[PDB]
Symmetry: C3
Subunit: 421 residues, 3 copies
């Protein structure tokens, strides 16, 4: 059996008191991870090539994820069964090197490790013909699925609370990669078309976005013994909320009291990303991100986000180093024009199983410091029924309340382990 | 470690709209599976022979099952811990070749693959001396356990709602197999005696069936490079409801509102089955079932069921074929004499890791069509308290209601993977 | 992948009726296990040495525990994710042979197998530098964590129900082992200091113990081809309730109706233990325990406990024996001076994968008999709100009630499997 996975687990403390806390800018879709992760998360994969004849084989892959809080030993939990697929390589003679897979699978996902942000991920139940050689590049085709909690009505109601039927959304993905636009550089182009797929006779809210498009262009350039990727994405409507390739065309959401509400996503998103890792010499490695994300919605509740951070690693020994991370977020409310921001500065001493910034296991002993100043937050007081600004951006002191994290500081510290295998 | 299991996962669509739907005749205990399974189901076994000395060994087996809906990636769930037993082979000198096992285990279960119907399965916590050589055949002995949700009273009440104590049932199984009644044919005979096993001082409802018997005779005939099994079973009372070897002698059931009710099972069941798989030549494989099940209860709510289906596979290549399934169900209400029926016709193009109809992995791309016409359904409207016909067969339009699936059509299609390893 | 674990699963019956029951003296923190365990419990570990260079390696270990009731096959459950750590051996040059680990881990726990009682176990999320060679012995250092359900107030309230915030507790452990105080004998000394660690601005109840100490001294003496351990421990305050190395400094507990209550643990505990296993000749093995535990609390609700039992095994064959266990408990209420006691006498015929009393797998067929007489129990009638003696020791007939198990008998029997691998 093949055994693979990922896991991070550790123990931390808050400078001001109690267990370790993690810091994330309100409105930001990520946080700088080093010395800023507060769960024990783990995926345990058990796969196995079950049949091979010459060039042909059938591979079987699975994945069961756990995520506990790490405040005790016995921590019962509901594991997510995330993957169970079969990939058949070289089964179509006239489409050599290509795979046909079906099942629940993590499909070609793209992410930025240091902020743990996945920008292109349509994983889920699915099927596809992957890696067809089109000569100048490799062409792939997949259809995956997701489904929103409610959003549909068995009959046409004018009352939003009548749209509580789960609504399946379908994504149809087409990618064209490994095109060498230049020397050292490759270009991948992708098109995603998602749409809410209603049961016969069901209806979505009026004005529900219903569908959308995600367009991706990733350029990878080999550099300094590392790489640099430059991404540019553009989403439309129903693809703006999840913003990674998955569709939410119903536009209905529910509060903790099962009350439906209208998170209308018509609009568009523009994402421009640049990240990579470069080795500069023998004693330094460093990863970096820079991103600007603009979710512009028709309802005016979008956000304009900017992040920048670097993680320079200096190797003392082939298995010991000093890692340092510095991140900065700044999110502006579309509805209110206010701005939230934060800068995190972490310093760690680690031991890796390798001389890379990419080598895992890694055992870290760190200290983190964050200082923020948020001038707006979301109004989640009340009920989707009691409240009418429920789920909206609102100023920090709106109606004499407290919204956002405030303007403060904090420092934490602890030991952690991280490993993909 | 040994790694074994089973898994099926896929993505589907409904001709009329939304995700794939599955079709099963109301009153039928199964449905024709090809292109008609709507969950991601998976069992992951991890066993290991932990000790061996010459002829003697101790094998340790486990099984953890998951079953998600496959409408998203992250799907939290409560896995069933189904097996954790130890089998000791050849530990009793004067009973050579025999095993002594104890633990929770799937014990010698018999099923009909294409309708995924298990007709002889007493699996559960248990213990037994398996495979004793009696000369003309192999004799096995096991005792397993199950327990119904409520059914017992701490004191004698006249009120059914007082019977909410879980009631353990015990099965005592004896099988005599591998007897060669003829050439190419073997005969297995089995006797199952189950009984509700009450705590000291507890009482079961009046008229509760309390116990029962299941009698099995299976004849396997080697044929056409395949086999054909002919089964005949007869159950009595408390063994009629589950009808596979497990006992439910309390006769109390609960509605979703915790209301007790009386699902009295005194009566008997007669099952006559014939299924198998035969290869006819080099280009065809085909499995088939034919069954007639008659659950006749004292309360008149039993059913008389008939199924027939065939799954012919024609091999284009050693690893590619066209599978087709055709199934027909027809269940008649004992209480009302009405009839529900359906015919499913599926057509699929698959790729297997083998030239057999039994070879897995298998990746299918299918289209299914079902057309039904049900004239009765069960009355599950209301409450075990509000309703008095609660849980009874009732005509399709009873009291101006709608019971049963109606008289309709539908077609679906999608891609799926199936694999046992 | 490395595959390890533990598992026990079986089927039992109660002499007087229904499934097997287990017997434990009210007030005792354990019971004699042989033929007296009523769950299917299982830990499945999957680890793997992920990197090795010469003397250096990184080992990755995990653990997922299940515990079902074993009254049916399909038994859904919430598995506990208990371990996910990385151990780096020999990574610190000038501290050779030593390990640095971080993650959630079962750390050097001590237990008495036959009563399944862990007397020194601080496992949980943690980190440490283990096995430093101090010359005369090996010195280890670890910090682990636990957290109580509530116990903290966001503001100073006088009302106990205001202390519902989870309160993290930290343990700081230091051990000094493998010191050879004599020939055949080793000495381990340990010091544990635990303390509730409050969020900035939170408050614990008044008089909450807040912290404490656990002091351990274990002497292992090689004897009769076995060992004998003699333990002496002394806890203080917040370490008295769990009494194994974990801290509970808040002193607030909750009833099943979320009502807070005061389980004040100021006081101390004195534990004097002696257990071991010795082989006496070729045909006998025998394990034994003897313990006296005195939890003396300021609130007068502590207990004074005494246990003694032996498990002599006589080998008929290298793989078959007759095991017998005899245990006696006697707990006296601190609050009421009354006494509860019981004696269990079990007799089993087993088959092991070895000629040891320590060899597993093991398949047992047993019969157990217990006879008790309890003169006090805890008052758990009512509510933390309705009741005021809620959670207190109370006489068997207090206020005309029934508290304690009474004065009775019972016998059970069944087959079971046990295995660590
Ligand atoms: O070798 C073929 C392989 O190559 C490439 O994979 C590499 C990635 O491109 C590269 O970025 C890197 O990926 C790492 C990732 O950086 C690292 O962080 C880790 O990812 C973890 C997250 O850290 C963890 O938080 C968790 O995230 C969850 C999240 O909590 C959950 O809410 C939801 O969003 O799902 C996430 C994922 O389940 O899990 C992820 C891992 O699942 O590990 C990544 C790799 O496993 O390194 C990769 C090689 O090691 C290609 O991208 C890939 O397609 C090729 O197959
Ligand atoms: O080699 C020794 C072995 O031989 C024989 O096993 C073979 C079977 O006789 C033969 O019929 C076939 O069995 C397959 C079965 O046909 C196939 O469908 C699959 O079974 C799955 C179901 O498909 C799946 O739905 C699921 O069913 C659950 C069900 O959802 C749940 O509600 C409840 O009813 O439990 C069921 C089972 O857990 O799971 C089953 C599998 O557990 O796989 C079967 C085999 O694993 O092929 C067998 C050999 O591959 C003997 O019968 C056997 O005793 C001998 O040990
Ligand atoms: O080889 C290096 C190893 O050596 C030593 O380990 C040995 C132990 O010292 C020795 O006593 C023995 O330990 C056994 C134990 O006797 C046996 O009972 C079993 O323990 C099970 C329990 O039986 C089982 O009930 C369960 O207990 C749970 C409990 O239900 C739960 O509520 C909570 O309290 O956690 C408990 C544990 O999770 O699980 C335990 C096992 O986890 O197995 C033990 C060993 O696995 O034999 C050991 C060697 O086989 C050192 O002590 C150890 O540090 C060294 O690493
Ligand atoms: Mg659960």
């Amino acid at each position: 059996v093949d055994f693979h996975g990922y896991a991070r687990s550790g123990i931390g403390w808050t400078g001001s008191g109690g267990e370790q806390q993690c810091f994330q800018t309100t409105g930001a879709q990520s946080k700088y991870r080093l010395g800023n992760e507060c769960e024990t998360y783990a995926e345990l994969k058990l796969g196995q090539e079950v049949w091979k004849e010459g060039d042909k084989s059938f591979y079987f892959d699975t994945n069961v994820a756990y995520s506990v809080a790490q405040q005790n030993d016995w921590e019962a939990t509901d594991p997510a069964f995330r993957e169970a697929n079969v990939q058949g390589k070289n089964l179509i003679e006239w489409l050599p090197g290509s795979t046909i897979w079906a099942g629940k699978r993590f499909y070609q996902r793209h992410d930025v490790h240091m902020i743990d942000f996945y920008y292109w991920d349509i994983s889920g139940p699915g099927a596809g013909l992957e890696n067809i050689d089109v000569g100048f590049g490799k062409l792939s085709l997949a259809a995956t699925r997701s489904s929103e909690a409610g959003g549909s009505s068995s009959f046409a109601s004018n009352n939003i609370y009548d749209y509580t039927n789960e609504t399946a959304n379908d994504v149809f993905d087409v990618r064209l990669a490994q095109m060498e636009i230049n020397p050292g550089g490759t270009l991948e182009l992708g098109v995603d078309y998602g749409r809410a797929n209603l049961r016969d006779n069901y209806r979505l809210v009026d004005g529900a976005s219903k569908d959308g498009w995600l367009f991706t262009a990733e350029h990878t350039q080999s550099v300094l013994k590392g790489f640099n990727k430059f991404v540019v994405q553009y989403a439309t409507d129903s693809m703006t909320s999840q913003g990674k390739g998955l569709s939410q065309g119903s536009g209905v959401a529910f509060d903790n009291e099962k009350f439906a509400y209208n998170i209308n996503n018509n609009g568009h998103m523009l994402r421009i990303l640049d990240h990579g890792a470069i080795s500069m010499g023998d004693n330094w490695d460093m990863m970096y991100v820079g991103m600007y994300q603009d979710i512009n919605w028709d309802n005016d509740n979008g956000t304009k986000w900017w992040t920048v951070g670097i993680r320079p690693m200096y190797k003392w020994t082939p298995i010991m180093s000093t890692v340092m991370e510095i991140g900065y977020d700044n999110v502006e409310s579309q509805r209110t024009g206010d701005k939230n921001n934060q800068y995190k500065i972490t310093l760690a001493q680690q031991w890796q199983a390798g001389d890379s910034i990419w080598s895992r296991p890694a055992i870290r002993v760190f200290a983190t410091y964050a200082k923020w100043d948020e001038k707006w937050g979301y109004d989640y007081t009340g009920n989707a029924d009691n409240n009418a600004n429920f789920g909206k951006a609102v100023p920090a002191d709106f109606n004499g309340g407290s919204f956002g994290r405030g303007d403060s500081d904090e420092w934490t510290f602890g030991a952690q382990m991280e490993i993909w295998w």
